[PDB]
Design a protein around this ligand. Structure first.
Ligand SMILES: O=C1Cc2cc(-c3c(-c4ccc(F)cc4)nn4c(N5CCC(O)CC5)nccc34)ccc2N1
Lengths: 187, 405, 407, 405, 407, 187
């Protein structure tokens, strides 16, 4: 139907927004050894903002990260500086969540001003752009977590971000289909 | 005969078992074996001694007095000196050196090159940028030729579809249409051959790059070091290298002096250890100028993170010394030549520098187990993909607005 | 016309304690290579022997200060025993005081390593050239490209096209596999997307092929040491010995460059490569997974290689040359006949028979016997399994569609 | 003391400059240096001598008289023998050998493997025949599945066009049609992935094959030589190896004796030179069984066409000999042990066998400049092509006749 | 307050004969490194010198039986001359009888080879992986396949199809380039032909790519010797010296393994690696195209590398260490001041200045200054030229077709 | 036209037959060094049957070849034996020439019995098969002339055989076109 599809659109938008938010704000992205805990290093469940440890008496206490350990050129050094700035800001996942929120707002508003049709189109565009930003963000994260036989693993925040991307793509498809049906109703 | 020396490895090092059965073996080093050999040749008696002032020979201007083994030799405290002591004008005026047993000179040290961090757009490395630019030009030109020769000699192949056809041919992704005229068919076939060769070459050279790793030193000399300014220089603050640069009058070394005087932060260090640490941790942006023998010794010590690059900026020699008017001077002068001609000195050099190498040979390992490609290698193409998708959506919206209005 | 107290020493398999010691007695209480050899020697010399063992459990050796022998040669020069049938190596000092028969068995220093285990290539090894991150991000990019294509192809009302979501996914998949589909984009947005996707695929496929070629090539130039020079010039593999013995002496007194280098490495060992017992070296090499090598008498190397677990290998010819021999006291009446018997036995092949018997026939490993390097079905089995799975899923969806479309 | 020897390189060889300043240096060889060392240890006087009868020691049964250095030692003409003389029972009964200075035994010689002539159908080498057969089976199965799932679930894909589609997919040559149902699309995608992986693997392994050459010996032992019968055996007609095989009672060597007795043409030769020539020119079909020392010497002589493979089939030793009742026997017995323990014998072995190597080391060269592929490498695919064209014309004519009638 | 007869020897660039000998006189008749050095030494010691040369044209050397010196040291110990300013190497025997100043210039045995010439990759090098026979037979097979396809497609009258000869050629070309055309065979004969052609193309393209990868990889692992160990272990390159001199002595008396091996190779030389003059070695290396190496004093190596033709290179650090020095008679009044002057000059950098002046500034080669290995436009230029040719031919055929079809 | 095409067909058939015949019977195929002349060897202009020399007093005199220098299995050894047998027989070029002759005979006979049409079809089939046999023959020759930095070159007999192949293909095309036209004339 149509109202069913709009309902699923809205629910998926809200679910993806929540998933991305908590994935950002849970610091359970990565498991590895750090050397910050006390010799390859001590276990740790890192995150997007603040690494955090789970061995020794330091368990349960943990701090932010630098993202600029060595020295480079502040104004303009190289692609490494830009990569580290983007990784520290993490503006791509945040942008994705913002776009999901805006798409949800647009689709919810569509119920009022039912005459308009470009609302759903804008919502779909926002959702797709959110997916693109999310995939860029994960690419940046992974490329930045490279040293240059250690071990690592990924946690549920990572998979939550991925699920947010998937839901964003699905919701964009559904919104575009809604717009297509509405334009069909016009003759 | 009492022989003076000084603590500087591998010329002087206390033995691992000096606490037990010290005898004459409490001291160990290249100079020790050399002193043994020369005393054997001259048939003398030597008990190894160390100068309480571990400073090298030099004379205080305000006092006119010497400080180091030079004081021992001039004042008679010591009968002979066997240490990494460099020949010099001022010291020769008071004592009588021998012919050098160790020839050396200022050199260069740098961080050993290591697998560079792969950058974005590295996937273009196998092909020179000129080849890529010519590829683009050929794409444009062949598309244009197809457009012309199809408009002016039809048997569909507008400019847009011509570009599409050429692009699809370059990626082996096939075509939605094919030329039906002999001219279009000729153009298509030639473009096809071009693409085949280019893709095969890209693949082959990438396989080469990933099969054998060759890491090249950015610098291979000292003039090549003066030409650029990205990398730093380094000299012990109070040591003969700094004076040699100061008093020099050759273009290259004067340029280095100007750089090292007008450069911040302070390139100089208070100890060779500080300079080697800076080189190790700077990640290839620091170059230290020291004596070649120490550099060769360091290069064979773990963590084996440094090499010596280039020749030598100067010629010097380490010379045994005796007091003026002695009788050991002539026999030692002959003895060093004896050892040099026979081969003793070369064997000792191998002994303390190459043998006992905490490192290995020039190539201790090879064919290192290849690493699977990581996202950092091919992240640039992902970025390009996403940028293209964004551009496509932008273009679609622009067309929407233009047509609706 | 009396008996002879032949001395021996329990070092397997030369002399062994029988399956049941408590039941048997006399010479028949032991078994091994040397007991049989003494049997044939007694046969060919015509005498009876009351077997015996050295209490010290040690081979001949002289304490410098005491100037006394500790072991078999002590059991002989002092008259305690009349013969010695054991792996009694021939040396200068030993021969200076007793009579050695001609060697019955030659040997020398050798090398032991971890036996190269039959490689398990691994199902899903065809993905190794590309890290799993790349594969998953490829999948996500494929989904994103398909959705963007659907959007830019079916967003306008002027068409209200063939590029639905399903056909978009099909087109993207065909593009990645460098095949192509019947439908192609006609607009500019779709063509931009297709071209950038095509570039992506080109790079990715070329990278996969190139890295795979590198993998196979480097796996194809690996050269096992097969010698000591290969073990000497290299430095990644550890090659140790016993803390004390004749191997350490051979390296110390070594006047050759290769073994001098080996001695320098062993002295400059971090950690200590040397070990105290051949069991220690065997376990260290077993567990070190090829990072360690052990030098020892070739004979023990062969025996061990024929022991459970059968996970050790001998490489290279013997570094040196030595010899075991039957010993007798100075000025005895046995040297002549014993030497004649040893030579006769070796000429008529008895000793090789016994060696085969006690090194291979009693060998638990029982292994006695293709470096093609062509790709094997194990290398690429995962894709075959994927193929079967896809075909089965296709049949299942066929049945679903058949049930579906009922009306 | 007069030392007997015999002409057998590198144990005895006349010096290149024997015509001038012959002295004691007219003779040269391993045995010469060994005799010098042992006489030095024992402090004796030796003038090198050669036996007029260059035959090795042996006794005529009908006469009971010895022929060779054994006659010299028993009859007193010679005080000592230093030659590559093997210890043996019969000879020990009359003289008194020493402990061996050279341990050896029967071995194997073969033609050094060389780049094999490329055969037709070599282009399948990178993939095992099982992979090709499974490829064919998968092609058939996927085509069948497509046919079924298209007949029983239509949205064209008969059996014939299904086979055509699968074949085109395997060759990356594209398709005239594509499945429109989810099931057909799934099958096509999976087949596509399969083809991608397989083509990439073929290309990569071919690159490996053409980059590094590894030539493997067909045999690595003597039992592995007895298992098969393609290759020949060889023994000097009158030499201890033939008797050792004759009197043997072990399974493998008895089997070899049976083969060498029941095989034609004559495996045996009258001289080692004939056997080595047969091995060199037979192109790997001849294996000669000789003594290991000679094999090692030959392997280091040009044209460097042979190696030694496998261990040794027997244990022997070369032993200095003295007449019974002498007093030199004990000092030489101790001297050989002196040399063995110190390292003299190993150094001499390196000296005459490894050093002076007309050949090089184990790997004198590497990374030989690669050769462009020749028609012989890919002639099989040309044959297949032409056969396919002939078959196509034949099928067309058959269809013509069938339809016209 | 008198003059000093300084001895020298004409060995370029140490002492040279001026551009015009007949016009000048006295000390001003020569030029070189050593004449200038003597100028500064006279300045810093304060004396005049009447330059001179050794008639024998030889360096110091003593005939054993005659026990007489042949050259400069003979010109000194016998009082004929008072000083010697030349590349007079410091040795034991020489120093036993005269006074050597401290070295003014250090050197040693080195290596000379053919300078690696800027590689000319070669237009049409992209065909090298496949022999021209393969390419031409490919063309012939393409023609045959096209004709057979035309035949089996347009032989029957039941169709009396799209597969004419022209379209057959187009289809075969597209098949070889792994692109594909709009038309495909529908019969069984055409499909057999297409499939077998496709297999052929697959094999051929894979072979081209693989052999090219091999070419590049092997060209990418080549390691120039850069040392003596690389020159020692290898045996393909020839490394000779002078027949007689100090290099042969250094190798003879060599107590090190590497140079002992070099000496063994040189003695076992086939043909004779040794040569009689440095000119002979220079020409032999110049013409041998890298199969030969020459060992000589580093200084001549640098001078030669700075000579026309500039086609020689020096590799590796000096094998040994030696020294030239100013000589004087035993018990003279010049040793002190001359040594002081040499040390002062070296400390204040004069000698390095003169060395640069006479080795590089007067260097004809004038060369003092990219191992990327990425494919360059020269590697694949032939295909670009082919592309231009094909486009031009297409335009020409376009003009023909335009003129054609007039009616 | 039609008679023009038939004339060209016949002329090309005869020309190709002559070219193949003389290419077989001229022994100027290859130039190389042999070691049979008297040290890499002496120059020689080899052939298909009899190598032949042009240096020294042996110039102008020359002999057949063996094609079986070493020893193999007479009844059945390996693909090498079959290759050498085929190369010695050279039955593929001879077969090609025979097929060209038969095609020429068929097309010439076509003038009589003008009613029949399968004559030209048979001629074209023969010509195409001749081309295939020729290309196989050259492949065999080249593969057999491989030793395992020498020099070699090819002579005018080689290029004559190639021209025969080209003419055979062209003539097959023309014959097929003739058959097509004749079938067209039938309604
Ligand atoms: O914000 C984000 C975070 C994120 C992660 C991913 C993702 C996933 C993923 C995510 C969610 C799922 F439901 C299923 C899979 N898996 N994955 C991998 N690998 C799979 C398992 C690993 O151990 C080895 C290789 N590498 C790189 C990325 C990645 C995709 C998009 C986004 N967007």
């Amino acid at each position: 139907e149509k109202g069913v599809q709009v309902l699923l659109t809205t629910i998926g938008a809200f679910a993806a927004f929540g998933l991305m938010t908590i994935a950002i704000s849970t610091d359970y992205w990565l498991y590895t050894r750090a050397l910050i805990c006390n010799d390859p290093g001590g276990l740790t469940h890192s995150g997007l903002w603040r690494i955090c440890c789970l061995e020794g008496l330091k368990r349960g206490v943990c701090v932010k990260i630098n993202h600029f350990p060595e020295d480079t050129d502040y104004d303009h050094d190289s692609a490494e500086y830009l990569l580290r700035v983007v990784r520290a800001s993490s503006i791509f996942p945040i942008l994705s969540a913002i776009l999901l929120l805006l798409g949800g707002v647009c689709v919810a508003a569509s119920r009022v001003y039912k005459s308009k049709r470009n609302i759903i189109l804008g919502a779909g565009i926002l959702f797709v752009a959110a997916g693109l930003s999310n995939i860029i963000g994960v690419i940046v994260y992974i490329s930045a977590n490279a040293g240059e036989k250690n071990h690592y693993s990924y946690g549920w925040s990572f998979y939550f971000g991925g699920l947010s991307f998937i839901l964003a793509e699905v919701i964009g498809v559904l919104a575009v289909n809604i717009y297509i049906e509405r334009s069909r109703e016009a003759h | 005969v009492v022989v003076t020396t000084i603590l500087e490895s591998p010329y002087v090092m206390m033995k691992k078992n000096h606490e037990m059965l010290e005898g004459n073996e409490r001291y160990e080093g290249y100079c020790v074996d050399l002193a043994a050999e020369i005393a054997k040749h001259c048939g003398f008696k030597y008990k190894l001694t160390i100068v309480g002032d571990g400073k090298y020979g030099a004379r205080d201007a305000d006092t006119k007095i010497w400080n180091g083994m030079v004081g021992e030799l001039v004042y008679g405290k010591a009968d002979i000196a066997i240490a990494p002591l460099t020949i010099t004008l001022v010291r020769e005026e008071v004592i009588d050196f021998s012919k050098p047993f160790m020839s050396l000179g200022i050199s260069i040290m740098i961080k050993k090159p290591q697998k560079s961090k792969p950058g974005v757009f590295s996937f273009l490395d196998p092909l020179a940028y000129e080849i890529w630019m010519c590829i683009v030009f050929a794409y444009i030109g062949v598309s244009v030729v197809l457009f012309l020769v199809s408009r002016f000699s039809p048997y569909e192949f507008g400019i847009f579809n011509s570009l599409w056809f050429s692009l699809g041919a370059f990626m082996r992704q096939g075509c939605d249409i094919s030329p039906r005229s002999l001219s279009g068919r000729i153009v298509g076939g030639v473009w096809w051959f071009f693409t085949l060769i280019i893709i095969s070459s890209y693949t082959a050279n990438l396989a080469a790059f990933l099969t054998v790793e060759r890491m090249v030193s950015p610098i291979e000399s000292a003039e090549d070091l003066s030409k650029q300014t990205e990398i730093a220089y380094g000299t012990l603050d109070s040591g003969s290298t700094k004076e040699f640069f100061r008093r020099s009058k050759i273009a290259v070394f004067d340029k280095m002096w100007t750089y090292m005087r007008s450069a911040e932060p302070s390139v100089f260090v208070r100890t060779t250890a500080e300079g080697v640490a800076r080189v190790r941790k700077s990640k290839g942006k620091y170059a230290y100028l020291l004596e070649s023998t120490m550099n060769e010794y360091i290069e064979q010590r773990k963590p084996c993170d440094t090499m010596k690059v280039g020749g030598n900026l100067d010629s010097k020699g380490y010379g045994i010394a005796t007091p003026k008017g002695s009788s050991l001077g002539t026999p030692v002068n002959l003895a060093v030549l004896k050892l040099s001609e026979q081969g003793v000195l070369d064997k000792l050099k191998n002994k303390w520098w190459y043998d006992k190498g905490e490192c290995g040979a020039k190539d201790s390992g090879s064919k290192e187990k290849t690493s699977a490609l990581s996202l950092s290698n091919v992240a640039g193409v992902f970025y390009i993909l996403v940028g293209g998708l964004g551009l496509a959506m932008l273009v679609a919206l622009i067309e929407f607005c233009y047509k609706s209005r | 016309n009396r008996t002879y107290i032949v001395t021996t020493i329990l070092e397997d398999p030369y002399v062994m304690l029988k399956k049941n010691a408590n039941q048997f007695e006399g010479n028949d209480r032991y078994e091994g290579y040397c007991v049989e050899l003494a049997a044939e020697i007694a046969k060919h010399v015509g005498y009876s022997y009351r077997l015996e063992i050295v209490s010290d459990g040690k081979y001949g050796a002289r304490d410098p200060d005491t100037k006394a022998w500790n072991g078999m040669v002590g059991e002989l020069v002092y008259g305690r025993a009349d013969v010695a049938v054991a792996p009694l190596t021939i040396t200068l000092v030993r021969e200076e005081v007793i009579d050695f028969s001609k060697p019955f068995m030659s040997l020398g220093i050798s090398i032991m390593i971890k036996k190269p285990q039959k490689s398990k290539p691994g199902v899903f090894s065809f993905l190794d050239p590309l890290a799993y991150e790349i594969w998953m991000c490829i999948v996500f990019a494929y989904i994103g490209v398909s959705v963007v294509l659907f959007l830019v192809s079916r967003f306008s009302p002027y068409e209200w096209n063939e590029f639905g979501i399903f056909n978009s996914l099909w087109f993207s998949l065909g593009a990645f596999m460098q095949q192509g589909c019947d439908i192609s984009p006609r607009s500019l947005s779709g063509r931009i997307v297709g071209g950038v996707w095509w570039f992506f695929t080109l790079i990715i496929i070329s990278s996969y092929t190139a890295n795979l070629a590198a993998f196979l090539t480097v796996e194809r130039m690996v050269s096992p040491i097969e010698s000591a020079e290969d073990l000497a010039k290299q430095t990644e593999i550890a090659y140790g010995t016993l803390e004390a013995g004749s191997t350490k002496e051979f390296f110390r007194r070594s006047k050759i460059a290769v073994f001098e280098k080996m001695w320098t490495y062993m002295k400059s060992a971090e950690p200590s490569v040397f070990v105290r017992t051949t069991e220690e070296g065997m376990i260290r090499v077993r567990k070190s997974k090829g990072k360690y090598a052990y030098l020892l008498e070739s004979t023990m190397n062969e025996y061990i290689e024929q022991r459970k677990p059968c996970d050790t290998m001998k490489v290279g010819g013997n570094l040196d040359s030595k010899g075991y021999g039957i010993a007798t006291p100075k000025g005895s009446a046995l040297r002549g006949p014993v030497n004649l018997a040893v030579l006769k036995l070796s000429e008529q092949g008895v000793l090789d028979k016994l060696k085969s018997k006690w090194w291979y026939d009693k060998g638990e490993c029982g292994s006695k016997d293709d470096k093609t390097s062509a790709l094997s079905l194990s290398n690429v089995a995962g894709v075959f399994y994927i193929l079967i799975g896809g075909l089965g899923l296709a049949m299942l969806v066929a049945l679903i569609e058949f049930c579906y479309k009922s009306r």
